[PDB]
Design a protein around this ligand. Structure first.
Ligand SMILES: [Mg+2]
Ligand SMILES: [Mg+2]
Ligand SMILES: [Mg+2]
Ligand SMILES: [Zn+2]
Ligand SMILES: [Zn+2]
Lengths: 115, 91, 141, 162, 55, 41, 83, 53, 407, 47, 111, 61
RNA sequence: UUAAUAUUUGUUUAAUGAAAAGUAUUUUAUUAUUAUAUUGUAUAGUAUUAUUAUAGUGUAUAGUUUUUUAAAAAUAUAAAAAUAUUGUUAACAACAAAUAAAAUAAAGUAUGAAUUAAUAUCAAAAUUUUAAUAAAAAUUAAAAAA
């Protein structure tokens, strides 16, 4: 349950996962490494391919978060939520960026592996 | 809603829902006369997309400008030159 | 304290809605309608609103000491096919009297017959405007 | 089905302990000296104090996300006005640093490294030794093979704890 | 016009059923045959096994 | 009928009613096979 | 693949890339204009076990540009002097 | 990758990758035994020497 | 007005016109600094009112003054470390005496008697572990001491190890010293002291398995594997680790150790059954991972190698009993359903200890991100509704999404 | 909590002024972002 | 869904680790004594309207938890699965009963 | 100076916004073009679960 | 004690420069242009991170990004038929009856005050009486728990 208000949580999805063009072979047992990275894929469906228009849209939206202004927004959000009294929010000095060069390189390697 | 081109005055109609309330004032739409992207301004008001609760589909309805704009481009004196080629009611 | 408003007895709490497939309710309704048809209290009808509303209706109501004979256009219908809950809305205007009748189907004393065989939507609109003007006028001022 | 719960009277009425007059417990010289809680029955194999520095993440996890705490990076009152400590903290300072008092050093100084001296009171009484070092400002002597205690040296990166 | 309540007036709430059902009660659980974790019937896990065949 | 266990009242395995003369003239009933120990605990 | 870049747009429009980027952020971050700041984003000294925190290190892009501030908002005296 | 591994299994006669590699390295060790036949931190540290005299 | 005390620490209603107080957000109460103020004391550095003077002299004394050592002294500190051989001899003697003086448990009739606690044994065994580089499980030690035959085995092996170390020295220390010297500038067989050590560690692991601590049993077997350099001892240790990992539901490690014990077949003595046990463990790990055809192939190869050892035969009979029913239900085990069902109670206990509960320890209470705890909103791996990442906007760079109403 | 909600366990009443003060505070936060002021919590001590 | 239950779970984990380090059997542990008594408290200002103010009490307490070994303890069965889960696993293809394999005992004969 | 600076800043912001909108519209048109190409190549038609006979009848639009 | 309380609950941003005020450790805050010493640039106030756009210039499409919750009563707003009442006007105001549909404000998980507090693990009810309500007495009677 959601800890804040103890509300019951529900996972809602579509049924025919395999008959779909997108989301063919996607694994939702655990989320991706980042929210802008492509979702997990089972080992059996590693060679799957996605529609090119949706792929380009996702690539644009993900490259949106690869800039330094996003890192500044991230640290500023840390500062805002720390000033607003929210606990378990580290100091913007202790925070670290979600997207770095080596991490992006290995994620690109994994994306080319998943083709 | 009814919008006009800022450059040439070309007018087209399209209802605005609750998901496009931010684009009711100014629309960046492709103009067929200017053959490029032009800014469109709000000219007249249509009824709505959905339905007012316990009110018919006519409520509220478009303004007198929208009703006049339609009647000049499609009506008795407007479709008469076009009723001789196809008579749109038929194919 | 001294009374109780609710009952938790099994007989009353239990419902039988799950077992309604063993009962053909719609078939029983159609059987009642067909019984009325064969007895002559109503005649079978099938139409849509766009083709029923606006048709003149001749209604003879058996009342003492003399039946009342009216002619009034259809303003609305409540059921497309024939049914025990068919319903019919009729606006009848006499020499100085304007009335809005809702005649139910299957009454042996209220014999109403549709005669136009057609819709006449423009006549419906005219009668609607007439009734609206008369209704707004009739209020005392 | 239902667990047995009972309201405790200590949560309804628990006053403070009787304080000590002149800081004197009237039975110090009468009762034996045993560690606190042993004879009463209070015992514990492990004590986890959630106020330590290493338990901060556990405390903040056990706390709820709804309850917020403000002034996390700043403070309403200016923290650069000099002001005195608490009474117990000033007493700790006075009890620890006693050589800060004026004219604390003994005069004349007679104890120099190389003198043979006997311990006349305290632990190791009647034992002889040679003065090794002299901490003159603290009025302290380091005698040879007298009051030998283990000096714990913490473990560094490349050196273990000795 | 309220006055202080004695310890016996405070414990009367425990005698009721509204207090016991809210505080003093346990859970009926079993081990998830897929996750090997304690689990109550009716609620399931975020897992492609526990979503298709939800035990 | 995932939750409906045949022969058991409301899916409770400790309320077996099969091979007993429970008269249901227009409802099916299953035979009785002795339940295992792990199915009841 | 040719997505919008602030530097490219500023090079196309000849609009001082620094000033162009400052056009899309609060004025108090780039100019000496009255604006409130969060106490968390301000630097804090070093502690035993952690290095020092510097506002200039943790927000390099959110620094006021004195050159742009003087050339846009502050008035020059060379145009005012009349001897 | 699914049909790729399926074709791998079909080519290696149902023997999985681990089984195949195990058999190959076991044959390697047996050949090594044949060649042999035909041919024939956690612990404590000691104290270091003194750094100076 | 003033329906209680006058100090700010009082608990009743006050007023400004009669009792004006300065703004004190949160300060410690009359008894002591609570955790709500110690949180500030550790994060902000002072109590959240700013009126309290930070007095950290005690923690300074506890950390910095203690860890301060002059360089001229630390240069010679390392030159007076105790002799490792003498330390090992003394630790072994003390541990052996403490194990020998352990009382024999009396067997009662009608109820299970409580075993005497190992109070004087945790310190000698700690010194033994820190001198030998191998950790021993206290539950396993207690079980070995409770078991009369295992206690005799442990005593005999420990006495043999003591005698060998006192007469010849420490062979692991010699090996490490020779390796370090060779690196600064081959491999002998398993010595008698190393043999006694791995034997007593195997006894400890067997006692730990009899107790029911498979993780500690496998750990003891793992740190005992580092002392055997003989093929027979290595094959036996690999079979033991495979069995322990099977019990602990470590299927990967069980399969690895089983195939290692199988690969150690050509250079092992023909009398040993460690290779057969390794094949058994490999096939069992396959069957637990639900690879029934793989397990059948492995057990068939194991039978052909060893013509029908009893363990291999029983495992093959069990696999055949499963194969006589798997096609009767599903013709195979589905690929997306393999290694999905729990079979052992070890993983049940592990899930009970480290599962996701209702309200806490789930993906809705706190999330971990690089050794730091975050709220459910600030989750970098999730952009579900309610996360802060849905309010980022275009950042004044370019229109990333075609969404008109949000973002 | 079904039995509790049935037997009315808890305050049958609720706060009434909040559904309007919430949107008032949201508008005030909009105004604060306009005036380039940091956003503060509506109820820091009244909680 | 209780904060106190979460705190007691943390305390139980710590006490179980301590008992296992002491040498006790995990499957035979039993909560022999659980009790709480008041601890340190903190104050927080509660500014009220009309120039009034009070001081809230941030309360905290201490928790004693004893785990003892009981060899005569018999735990109830918690592996019984509902009929719905049983037949769902059957429909999927999984065995209703967990697969158990005999594991030979640890032997030190090869050394 | 204030007047001129404010007007220049607002004008430059307007021009940058116009460029951004133009580029995004161009990219979305290219996206729709690629989507149409892929749909025609894969046989996908977003005209419902039915076939082309319904559209040929064009009784529903 | 009230208190299993009231209250809080952070899921979607339409706007642009000072000075008084505030001093919060700006580690070199900025990196440069011009010229020419010196001096100083981030955060109001209402006991608060509070119904809050301090209106000194100036103009404007940057969406210039912290408000939980699965039914109810009473209350608070908004709407509220082809019934009826009084006026304006060529739809507007309240009303009385169907005052009815429909909108917003839940336990429960958390945090947590204040008025108040002589008191028995307080005593349903009726009758008679006694120095002003008498819960004070007496007689009949028989009054469950949450
Ligand atoms: Mg200040
Ligand atoms: Mg202020
Ligand atoms: Mg005030
Ligand atoms: Zn145009
Ligand atoms: Zn599960």
């Amino acid at each position: 349950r959601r800890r804040t208000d103890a509300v019951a949580m529900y996972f809602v999805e579509y049924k025919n996962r395999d008959m779909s063009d997108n989301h063919k072979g996607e694994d939702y047992s655990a989320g991706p490494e980042r929210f802008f990275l492509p979702p997990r894929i089972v080992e059996t469906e590693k060679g799957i391919q996605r529609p090119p228009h949706m792929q380009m849209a996702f690539d644009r939206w993900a490259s949106k978060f690869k800039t330094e202004e996003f890192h500044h927004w991230w640290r500023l959000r840390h500062a805002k939520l720390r000033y607003w009294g929210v606990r378990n929010v580290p100091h913007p000095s202790d925070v670290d960026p979600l997207w770095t060069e080596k991490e992006e390189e290995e994620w690109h390697n994994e994306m080319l592996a998943n083709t | 809603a009814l919008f006009s081109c800022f450059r040439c005055g070309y007018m087209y109609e399209f209802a605005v829902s609750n998901s496009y309330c931010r684009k009711l004032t100014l629309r960046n739409d492709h103009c067929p006369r200017c053959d490029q992207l032009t800014l469109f301004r709000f000219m007249s008001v249509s009824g709505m997309v959905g339905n007012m609760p316990f009110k018919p589909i006519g409520v509220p309805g478009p303004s007198y400008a929208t009703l006049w704009w339609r009647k000049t481009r499609e009506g008795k004196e407007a479709s008469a030159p076009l009723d001789a080629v196809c008579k749109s009611d038929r194919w | 304290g001294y009374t109780r408003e609710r009952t938790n007895r099994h007989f009353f709490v239990a419902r039988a809605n799950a077992f309604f497939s063993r009962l053909p309710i719609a078939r029983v309704q159609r059987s009642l309608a067909m019984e009325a048809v064969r007895e002559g209290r109503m005649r079978p009808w099938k139409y849509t609103k766009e083709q029923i509303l606006g048709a003149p209706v001749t209604c003879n109501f058996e009342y003492n000491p003399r039946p009342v004979r009216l002619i009034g256009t259809v303003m609305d219908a409540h059921t497309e096919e024939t049914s025990i809950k068919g319903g019919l809305k009729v606006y009848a205007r006499n020499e100085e009297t304007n009335m809005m009748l809702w005649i139910p189907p299957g009454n042996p004393k209220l014999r109403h017959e549709v005669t136009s065989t057609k819709g006449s939507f423009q006549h419906y609109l005219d009668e609607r405007d007439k009734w609206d003007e008369a209704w707004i006028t009739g209020r005392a001022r | 089905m239902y667990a047995r719960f009972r309201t405790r009277s200590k949560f309804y009425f628990r006053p403070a302990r009787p304080a000590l007059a002149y800081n004197v417990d009237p039975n110090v010289m009468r009762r034996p000296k045993v560690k606190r809680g042993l004879l009463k029955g209070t015992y514990s194999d492990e004590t986890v104090d959630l106020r330590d520095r290493e338990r901060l993440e556990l405390l903040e996890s056990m706390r709820h996300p709804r309850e917020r705490d403000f002034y996390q990076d700043h403070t309403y009152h200016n923290q650069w006005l000099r002001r005195d400590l608490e009474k117990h903290q000033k007493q700790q300072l006075a009890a620890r640093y006693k050589y800060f008092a004026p004219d604390f050093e003994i005069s004349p100084w007679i104890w120099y490294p190389g003198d043979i001296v006997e311990v006349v009171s305290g632990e190791g009484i009647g034992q002889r030794g040679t003065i090794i070092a002299v901490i003159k400002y603290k009025n302290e002597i380091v005698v040879q093979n007298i009051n030998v205690q283990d000096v714990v040296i913490p473990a560094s990166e490349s050196r273990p704890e000795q | 016009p309220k006055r202080k309540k004695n310890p016996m007036q405070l414990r009367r709430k425990v005698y009721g059923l509204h207090f016991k059902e809210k505080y003093l009660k346990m859970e009926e659980w079993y081990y998830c045959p897929l996750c090997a974790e304690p689990k109550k019937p009716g609620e399931w896990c975020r897992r492609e096994d526990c979503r298709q065949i939800k035990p | 009928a995932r939750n409906l266990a045949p022969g058991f009242s409301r899916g409770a395995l400790k309320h077996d009613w099969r091979a007993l003369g429970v008269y249901t003239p227009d409802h099916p009933q299953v035979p009785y096979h002795p339940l295992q120990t792990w199915m009841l605990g | 693949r040719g997505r919008f870049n602030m530097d490219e747009a500023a090079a196309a429009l000849q609009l001082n890339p620094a000033y162009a980027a400052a056009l899309y952020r609060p004025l108090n971050y780039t100019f000496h204009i009255r604006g409130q700041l969060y106490p968390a984003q301000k630097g804090r000294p070093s502690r035993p076990g952690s290095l020092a925190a510097s506002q200039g290190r943790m927000f390099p892009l959110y620094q006021r540009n004195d050159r742009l501030d003087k050339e846009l908002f502050r008035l020059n005296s060379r145009g005012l002097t009349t001897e | 990758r699914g049909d790729a591994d399926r074709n791998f299994r079909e080519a290696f006669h149902g023997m999985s990758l681990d089984q195949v590699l195990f058999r190959e390295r076991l044959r390697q060790r047996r050949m090594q035994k044949q060649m042999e036949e035909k041919a024939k931190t956690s612990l404590s540290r000691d104290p270091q020497p003194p750094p100076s005299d | 007005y003033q329906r209680g005390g006058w100090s700010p620490g009082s608990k009743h209603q006050k007023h400004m016109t009669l009792n004006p107080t300065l703004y004190l957000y949160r300060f410690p109460g009359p008894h002591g600094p609570g955790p709500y103020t110690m949180k500030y004391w550790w994060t902000l550095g002072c109590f959240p009112t700013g009126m309290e003077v930070p007095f950290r002299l005690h923690e300074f004394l506890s950390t910095y003054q203690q860890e301060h050592v002059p360089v001229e002294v630390e240069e010679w500190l390392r030159c007076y470390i105790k002799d490792p051989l003498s330390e090992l001899v003394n630790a072994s003697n003390d541990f052996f005496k403490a194990v020998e003086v352990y009382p024999e448990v009396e067997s009662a009739r009608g109820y299970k008697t409580l075993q005497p606690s190992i109070a004087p044994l945790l310190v000698p065994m700690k010194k033994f572990e820190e001198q030998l580089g191998v950790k021993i499980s206290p539950v396993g030690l207690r079980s070995v001491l409770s078991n009369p035959v295992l206690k005799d085995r442990f005593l005999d092996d420990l006495f043999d190890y003591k005698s060998y170390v006192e007469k010849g020295g420490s062979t692991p220390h010699r090996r490490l010293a020779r390796s370090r010297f060779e690196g600064s500038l081959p491999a002998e067989t398993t010595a008698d002291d190393e043999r006694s050590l791995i034997l007593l560690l195997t006894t400890i692991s067997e006692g730990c398995i009899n107790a029911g601590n498979y993780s500690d049993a496998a750990s003891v077997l793992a740190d005992a594997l580092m002392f055997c350099h003989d093929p027979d001892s290595q094959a036996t240790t690999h079979a033991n680790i495979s069995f322990a990992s099977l019990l602990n539901a470590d299927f990967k490690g069980a399969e690895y150790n089983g195939r290692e014990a199988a690969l150690l077949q050509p250079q092992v003595k023909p009398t040993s059954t460690a290779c057969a046990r390794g094949y058994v463990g490999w096939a069992a790990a396959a069957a637990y991972q639900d690879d029934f055809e793989k397990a059948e192939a492995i057990v068939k190869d194991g039978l052909t190698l060893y013509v029908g050892n009893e363990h291999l035969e029983k495992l093959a009979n069990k696999l055949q009993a499963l194969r006589e029913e798997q096609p009767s239900v599903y013709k195979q085990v589905p690929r997306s359903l393999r290694e999905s069902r729990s079979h052992l109670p070890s993983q049940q206990s592990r899930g009970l200890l480290s599962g996701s509960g209702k309200g806490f320890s789930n993906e809705f209470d706190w999330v971990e991100f690089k050794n730091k705890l975050y709220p459910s909103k600030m989750d970098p791996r999730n952009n579900e509704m309610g996360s802060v990442f849905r309010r980022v906007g275009d950042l004044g760079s370019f229109i990333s999404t075609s969404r008109s109403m949000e973002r | 909590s079904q039995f509790l909600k049935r037997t009315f366990v808890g305050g049958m009443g609720y706060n009434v002024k909040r559904p309007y003060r919430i949107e008032i505070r949201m508008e005030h936060d909009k105004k604060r972002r306009m005036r380039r002021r940091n956003i503060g919590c509506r109820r820091m001590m009244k909680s | 869904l209780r904060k106190g239950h979460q705190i007691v779970f943390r305390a139980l984990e710590m006490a179980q680790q301590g008992a296992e380090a002491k040498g006790l059997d995990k499957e035979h542990l039993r909560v022999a004594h659980i009790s709480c008594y008041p601890g340190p408290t903190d104050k927080q200002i509660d500014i009220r309207s009309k120039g009034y103010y009070a001081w809230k009490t941030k309360k905290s307490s201490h928790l004693v938890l004893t785990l003892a070994e009981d060899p005569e303890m018999v735990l109830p069965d918690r592996t019984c699965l509902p009929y719905s889960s049983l037949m769902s696993m059957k429909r999927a293809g999984l065995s209703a009963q967990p697969t158990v394999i005999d594991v030979p005992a640890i032997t030190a004969d090869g050394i | 100076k204030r007047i001129d600076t404010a007007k220049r800043m607002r004008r430059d912001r307007r021009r940058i916004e116009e460029l951004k909108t133009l580029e995004f519209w161009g990219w979305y048109m290219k996206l729709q073009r690629v989507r149409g190409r892929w749909c025609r190549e894969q046989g996908v038609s977003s005209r419902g679960v039915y076939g082309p006979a319904v559209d040929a009848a064009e009784l529903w639009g």
